[PDB]
From a paper:
Here we describe the determination of the crystal structure of CinA from T. thermophilus (TtCinA), which contains both the NMN deamidase and COG1058 domains and is therefore a bifunctional enzyme. In addition, we show that TtCinA adopts a three-domain structure, with a third, previously unidentified, KH-type domain between the NMN deamidase and COG1058 domains. We demonstrate that TtCinA adopts an asymmetric dimer and present structures with NCN, ADP-ribose, AMP, and ATP bound, which provide experimental validation for the modes of substrate binding proposed previously. We use these structures to propose models for both enzymatic activities and suggest that large scale movement of the COG1058 domains is linked to ADPR catalysis as well as providing a rationale for the usual asymmetric arrangement of the TtCinA dimer.
Data were collected from three different complexes, following soaking of TtCinA crystals with ADP-ribose, ATP, and AMP/ribose 5-phosphate. A strong peak in the electron density map, inferred to be from Mg2+, was identified between the α and β phosphates. Such a location would be consistent with pyrophosphatase activity. Asp-76 binds the Mg2+ ion and is absolutely conserved in CinA sequence alignments. Glu-156 appears to play an important part in recognition of the terminal ribose ring; it forms two hydrogen bonds to the 2′- and 3′-hydroxyl groups in the ribose ring and is also absolutely conserved in sequence alignments. In addition, the binding of the Mg2+ ion appears to be stabilized by Glu-187, which extends from the end of an α-helix in the KH domain into the ADP-ribose binding site. Conversely, the closed site is more likely to correspond to the catalytically competent state; critically, the close approach of the KH domain from chain A, with Glu-187, would promote the binding of Mg2+ and hence polarize the P=O bond for hydrolysis. A major feature of the TtCinA structure is the asymmetry in the dimer, which is caused by contact between a KH-type domain on the opposite chain and the bound ADP-ribose.
Numbering used by the authors:
A (entry chain B), B (entry chain A): 1 to 394
Write the structure that this text describes.
């Protein structure tokens, strides 16, 4: 098995000022291909060391993938280092320069001189278009080997990588991963519910991964084994599984609302807006989500329809019900969600951080669910958002 | 300046099954010393590739540090790789083996035979005690160079490292770093404004880090050189610096509101609640943040005060101003922020994705800023949140 080598470029990655997730994500994407990943590197933004590491990775590898340092600044040296490592001159491509200039023109700016180096390439490179930023990537095919340069930000490189990857002509191997997403059941109860299905052979293996949106059950390995094992696991957890793969609670809610021709609105306290944020993260949200209130003060709560009598007891089922009913009446939506409780770090009304009520008001009345969540302030806010969503799709 | 090499060992680190914080944490611990970290590696649990990387690392470095693979399983091969890489045989230390047998006896168990190999070390190694786990570390002094082996778990290695590090006799250099957080200036303008200040020497260097919350400018290296160069730099960027170090936009906004005794509300369209969520992320936000509305439907935009005549150009500076003025009136807050625009993927009102207006209303009036953000839907939404917060801290 030939090697894939994967280098994250950036001094800030060495120190973990940002944690390098790119090399790992790229390693994971390579699992359906018959390439060995023996190591990954993070490399400082310095031309001579980077060139040395690139030259060495390329010598030993079928595929070398770099991310980062394609920007316009003196700390962005990946293109100069790669051209040094491959023994090729960097050449300005006028057409790409024109494209960057147009990108700045559209935004009402003249292109600064520093951007020019983003349009440089070596003879062996073809361009990988980047509609999400100013630095296009490179794909170098040379001597039967591939070297791919990607911009550092994941929102920019992910769809570039996704497109180039099948074009590389890499040898395949039958791998698959199936992600089964559950809610309201702990790791232990899942293991025990599965029993012999909880396989950990080298052909195929099952794992449990607790997340803020519930425990994932992940099946990975040889594609045939994954498909069959995942089917059987899915049956054992049929009541707990709310979606798979790319499905999210926010998208499942969207599917339900569009199936019913229904609308949704929200009123939030401790989640601060994060619930409306999560609903609207999914394209098409405006077809059903009418909007929401962030009632983060007594005055706002009263103004938008929560009864005076409840205002001094916010950590309660009665409050979560009244807020969902207030939202529904204010927006006239088919359904409304509410969140109230203690995020942390301080207790509130004698209740510890993590004490949360979420409520759903619909045509047939209201329901409330109480949780006691583990985690710091941000984690409790997150789990509260997924718990309110779960009211509609679990 | 000589090199320090840092290798995290473990196949799971390559794929992100375990997130490699060890290598970065060790690199940060080395900042007080005159050593260059050019790269960090993560390496698979295989004895041949691991020994090759250790050999290469040791050859080029004054210091090598490894973590992980000190366990008792067949996949724990770090001791074997180091011995191989350094051309020395492993030797059983009978006293350490008795300590391991004590560890298992201390918990009512015989020592499994697999744990025997944890008492092996090479002649050039002294032991590093581990009172938290069974694997002692190594300190190898050889050829005026140091190589340290540490166990994978942070609670085990952290005290071990802190104890051995000041014994290694590493050359010290007075280190400092300064992080300047900017908004509303791109990397190229920064390059041009700074010009020759954008130093990249061995004693001191300047870097930029483009984030969704704006460009961070980092100066790091010799203590006297960093203070002067960062002061000059901050003076060149005075209008655009809104914070330093650990400061965040949400915290900066909190500071201003507490300084003035002022309150804040929001009205959001495209950001969907994300702006409220970012404001309330910081503990103590309830002292100034009254709440907000998410006016996602045209009906909600009209309900919360956007004038009828603007509902056909909700993506405009006039509407953003009207939304901020409405929120301010609706909540009776000192200030209000509003967001409106085109998140993507589809255009809206003829305007392309990334077209965003943010506005601030206060006692002295309202103001609006327009942006054209490249990026996918989630990125446009995030940038808009920070753009709105930047109106209050410039
Ligand atoms: N290994 C990594 N893992 C996770 N995130 C990363 C990594 N490397 C970079 N990032 C993220 O990307 C950010 C920018 O990293 P750079 O290396 O500077 O990316 P660069 O390739 O130079 O491009 C920067 C910007 O310039 C534009 O022309 C280009 O389109 C991009 O918008 C980092 O601050 C970090 O948030
Ligand atoms: N680079 C890393 N970054 C962060 N955490 C890490 C890293 N490497 C390991 N860890 C953490 O430590 C855990 C164990 O990693 P191993 O490499 O297996 O640790 P190892 O040195 O082999 O020792 C494991 C156990 O065996 C004992 O004898 C030894 O004392 C330790 O208790 C990992 O699951 C992870 O939680
Ligand atoms: Mg860059
Ligand atoms: Mg181990």
């Amino acid at each position: 098995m030939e090697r894939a080598e994967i280098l994250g470029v950036g001094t800030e990655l060495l120190y973990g000022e940002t944690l390098d997730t790119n090399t790992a994500e790229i390693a994971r994407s390579l699992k359906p291909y018959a390439l060995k990943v023996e190591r990954t590197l993070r490399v400082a933004d310095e031309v001579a060391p980077l060139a040395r590491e690139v030259e060495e990775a390329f010598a030993r590898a079928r595929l070398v993938v770099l991310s980062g340092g394609l920007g316009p600044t003196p700390d962005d040296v990946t293109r100069e280092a790669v051209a040094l490592a491959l023994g090729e001159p960097l050449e300005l491509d006028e057409a790409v320069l024109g494209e960057i200039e147009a990108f700045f023109r559209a935004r009402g700016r003249a292109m600064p001189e520093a951007n020019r180096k983003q349009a440089m390439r070596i003879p062996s490179a073809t361009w990988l278009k980047n509609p999400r930023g100013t630095a296009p990537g490179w794909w170098v095919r040379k001597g039967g080997k591939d070297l791919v340069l990607l911009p550092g930000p994941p929102p920019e490189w992910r769809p570039m990588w996704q497109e180039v990857l099948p074009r590389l002509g890499l040898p395949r191997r039958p791998y698959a991963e199936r992600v089964l997403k559950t809610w309201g059941i702990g790791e232990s109860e899942i293991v025990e519910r599965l029993g012999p299905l909880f396989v950990r052979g080298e052909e195929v293996e099952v794992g449990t991964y607790p997340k803020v949106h519930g425990v994932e059950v992940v099946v990975r390995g040889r594609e045939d084994r994954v498909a069959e094992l995942a089917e059987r696991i899915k049956k054992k957890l049929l009541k707990e599984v709310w979606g798979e793969g790319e499905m999210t609670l926010a998208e499942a809610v969207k599917r339900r609302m569009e199936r019913e021709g229904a609308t949704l609105s929200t009123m939030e306290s401790l989640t601060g807006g994060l619930l409306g944020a999560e609903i609207t993260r999914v394209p098409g949200a405006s077809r059903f989500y009418l909007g929401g209130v962030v009632s983060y003060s007594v005055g706002a709560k009263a103004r938008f329809g929560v009864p005076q009598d409840l205002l001094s007891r916010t950590v309660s089922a009665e409050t979560a019900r009244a807020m969902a009913e207030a939202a529904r009446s204010l927006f006239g939506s088919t359904y409304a969600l509410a969140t109230t409780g203690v995020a942390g770090p301080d207790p509130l009304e004698g209740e510890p951080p993590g004490t949360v009520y979420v409520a759903l008001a619909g045509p047939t009345g209201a329901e409330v669910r109480r949780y006691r969540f583990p985690g710091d302030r941000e984690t409790v806010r997150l789990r509260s958002v997924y718990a309110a969503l779960a009211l509609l799709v679990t």
